[PDB]
Amino acid sequence: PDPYGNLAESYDRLAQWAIDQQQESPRDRVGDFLQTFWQSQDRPVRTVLEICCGTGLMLAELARRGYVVTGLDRSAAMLEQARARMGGKTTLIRAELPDIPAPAGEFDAVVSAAGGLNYLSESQISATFGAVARLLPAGGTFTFDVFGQGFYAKFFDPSAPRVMALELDDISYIWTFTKPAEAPFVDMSYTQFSPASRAVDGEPAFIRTRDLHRYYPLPHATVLRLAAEHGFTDARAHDNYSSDPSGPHTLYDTWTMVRTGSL
Amino acid sequence: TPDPYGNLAESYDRLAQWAIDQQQESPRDRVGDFLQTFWQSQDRPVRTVLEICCGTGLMLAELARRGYVVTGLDRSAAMLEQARARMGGKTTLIRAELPDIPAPAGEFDAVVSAAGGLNYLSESQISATFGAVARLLPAGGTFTFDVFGQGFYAKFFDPSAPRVMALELDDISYIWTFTKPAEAPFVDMSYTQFSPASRAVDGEPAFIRTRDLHRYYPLPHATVLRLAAEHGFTDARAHDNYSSDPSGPHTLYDTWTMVRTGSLE
Numbered sequence: 001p002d003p004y005g006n007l008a009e010s011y012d013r014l015a016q017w018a019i020d021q022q023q024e025s026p027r028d029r030v031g032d033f034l035q036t037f038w039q040s041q042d043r044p045v046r047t048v049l050e051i052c053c054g055t056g057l058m059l060a061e062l063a064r065r066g067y068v069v070t071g072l073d074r075s076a077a078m079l080e081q082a083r084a085r086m087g088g089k090t091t092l093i094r095a096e097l098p099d100i101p102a103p104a105g106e107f108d109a110v111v112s113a114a115g116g117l118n119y120l121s122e123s124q125i126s127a128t129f130g131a132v133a134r135l136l137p138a139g140g141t142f143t144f145d146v147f148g149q150g151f152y153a154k155f156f157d158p159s160a161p162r163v164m165a166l167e168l169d170d171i172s173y174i175w176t177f178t179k180p181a182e183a184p185f186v187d188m189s190y191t192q193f194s195p196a197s198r199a200v201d202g203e204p205a206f207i208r209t210r211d212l213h214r215y216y217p218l219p220h221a222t223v224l225r226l227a228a229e230h231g232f233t234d235a236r237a238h239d240n241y242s243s244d245p246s247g248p249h250t251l252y253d254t255w256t257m258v259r260t261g262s263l
Numbered sequence: 264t265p266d267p268y269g270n271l272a273e274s275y276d277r278l279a280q281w282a283i284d285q286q287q288e289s290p291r292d293r294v295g296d297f298l299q300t301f302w303q304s305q306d307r308p309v310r311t312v313l314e315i316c317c318g319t320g321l322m323l324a325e326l327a328r329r330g331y332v333v334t335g336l337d338r339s340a341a342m343l344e345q346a347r348a349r350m351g352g353k354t355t356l357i358r359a360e361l362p363d364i365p366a367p368a369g370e371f372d373a374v375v376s377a378a379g380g381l382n383y384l385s386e387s388q389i390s391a392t393f394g395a396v397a398r399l400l401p402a403g404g405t406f407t408f409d410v411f412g413q414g415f416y417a418k419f420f421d422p423s424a425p426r427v428m429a430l431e432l433d434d435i436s437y438i439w440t441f442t443k444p445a446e447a448p449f450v451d452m453s454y455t456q457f458s459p460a461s462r463a464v465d466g467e468p469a470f471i472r473t474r475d476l477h478r479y480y481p482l483p484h485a486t487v488l489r490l491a492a493e494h495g496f497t498d499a500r501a502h503d504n505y506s507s508d509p510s511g512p513h514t515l516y517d518t519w520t521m522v523r524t525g526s527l528e
């Protein structure tokens with residue numbers, strides 16, 4: 001049940017390709033957006049938890065800017081990469097959201113960059129909003145991105161190819177996007193062909209793996225309700241870590257919100 | 264002379280059927296219907312038919328089913344062996360690369376080329392092929408073929424960037440990359456194919472990868488009309504994919520028919 005287990009060793013190269021070819025934000029741009037957002041807030045930010053930290057690309061960006069960072073992810077394979085990047089001092093928590101085994105009065109901000117929250121059902125993200133609210137003091141903030149309208153329009157029909165593929169550094173990926181009838185999720189299947197350890201007779205060989213990435217579309221009305229229900233205010237959406245508004249073409253919606261003084 | 268169908272021949276028939284079932288390619292009996300109706304409209308009867316670029320013989324088998332006496336020509340030994348299995352020993356199969364057609368004058372009543380073999384010919388090679396076909400046909404015989412239409416290039420080729428598509432079919436996986444090299448008279452469709460290996464690697468099934476370039480030469484309508492006029496044909500007409508519909512900007516496969524004149528070629 002870890003779709004990133006087979007992806008972890010090539011994830012960083014694929015993330016760079018997605019920046020180069022699928023308009024994903026480089027983590028330094030995410031860092032610029034976060035610092036501009038936090039600088040506009042009254043309460044200073046020193047400690048940051050990134051949930052769904054993956055291989056730690058965003059952790060490293062924030063640490064380079066002087067933040068004291070902690071990461072959380074469910075994937076041991078991804079966290080092994082994050083440990084190699086960050087070294088031994090960085091706290092890395094292996095847990096599956098909505099579980100956040102960490103105490104209140106500790107984090108000034110929580111972030112989730114590059115779409116980990118797309119993997120959570122509505123009830124799982126609701127409980128995650130609650131867990132984040134318990135960790136943040138009044139005036140702390142929560143920032144994350146999820147797929148926008150333009151993503152579902154572009155990769156989940158119409159007129160679009162249902163199968164996509166990429167050949168990158170001797171690995172090959174074949175992606176299939178399916179929308180089950182009457183389901184609250186959409187499915188992206190990763191077929192991956194990777195060079196094998198040895199050869200078959202006199203030919204190079206490849207191992208095939210198949211992994212399902214199940215995504216839950218998150219309407220704006222749902223985000224706003226979840227924010228209100230869990231002690232957040234001033235929820236705003238922007239297009240992909242820019243100052244532009246969310247709109248019909250947005251591929252990645254960036255949400256920011258502020259913890260109230262509620263309990 | 265590379266043979267891009269060498270690695271494809273084993274799985275070609277399954278892929279061709281997928282393209283009919285899913286990509287609007289004409290079922291071979293629709294091609295047969297179209298040919299029989301077109302030939303029936305001509306004064307000169309048709310019994311003997313040469314299919315150039317016959318591949319694995321899917322169109323040979325359809326024309327034989329309808330009662331024609333068919334001969335096939337293809338450059339790919341791998342494809343032709345499949346045609347030999349399909350047709351048996353009675354059918355003449357010629358291994359030759361167009362424009363070479365080593366067959367006698369006064370032999371064929373019609374020449375056909377179904378499912379896109381002529382897309383692989385440069386304008387010079389297709390001009391020479393028109394000449395060779397003209398020499399094989401008596402006055403009143405006909406030549407029918409299909410090439411990619413305007414809608415095919417618009418759908419699969421982007422002038423600005425490569426396009427990538429894929430298919431997983433019966434444990435074979437294809438990755439297709441479509442490019443338009445600058446200033447070239449061709450466009451490129453690369454086939455990466457993953458097929459099951461002969462043995463396993465440790466405890467995991469293994470796959471072999473092949474890569475083969477399919478190089479296609481767009482053939483504008485004005486060029487077909489010119490080639491027909493230059494090589495002894497008349498009444499050149501285009502239809503959409505072996506139907507009675509006209510060729511149009513959305514057509515994926517342009518079906519051309521033309522009639523041999525009395526000129527000496």
Ligand SMILES: Nc1ncnc2c1ncn2[C@@H]1O[C@H](CSCC[C@H](N)C(=O)O)[C@@H](O)[C@H]1O
Pocket residue numbers: 004015027051052053054055056057058072073074075078095096097098112113114115116117119120
């Ligand atoms: N319910 C869940 N709990 C914890 N981690 C989850 C999760 N669902 C998805 N993930 C993690 O979400 C990550 C998405 S990849 C994003 C990695 C990183 N934030 C970056 O900027 O590159 C994966 O590592 C995946 O394991």
Ligand SMILES: Nc1ncnc2c1ncn2[C@@H]1O[C@H](CSCC[C@H](N)C(=O)O)[C@@H](O)[C@H]1O
Pocket residue numbers: 268279315316317318319320321322336337338339342359360361362376377378379380381383384
């Ligand atoms: N210059 C050339 N000379 C001969 N055959 C050629 C050729 N260029 C391409 N071909 C052949 O064109 C074929 C295209 S596939 C079409 C197969 C068949 N007509 C059918 O209806 O399914 C391949 O078998 C390929 O080897």
Ligand SMILES: [Cl-]
Pocket residue numbers: 023024025240
């Ligand atoms: Cl961008």
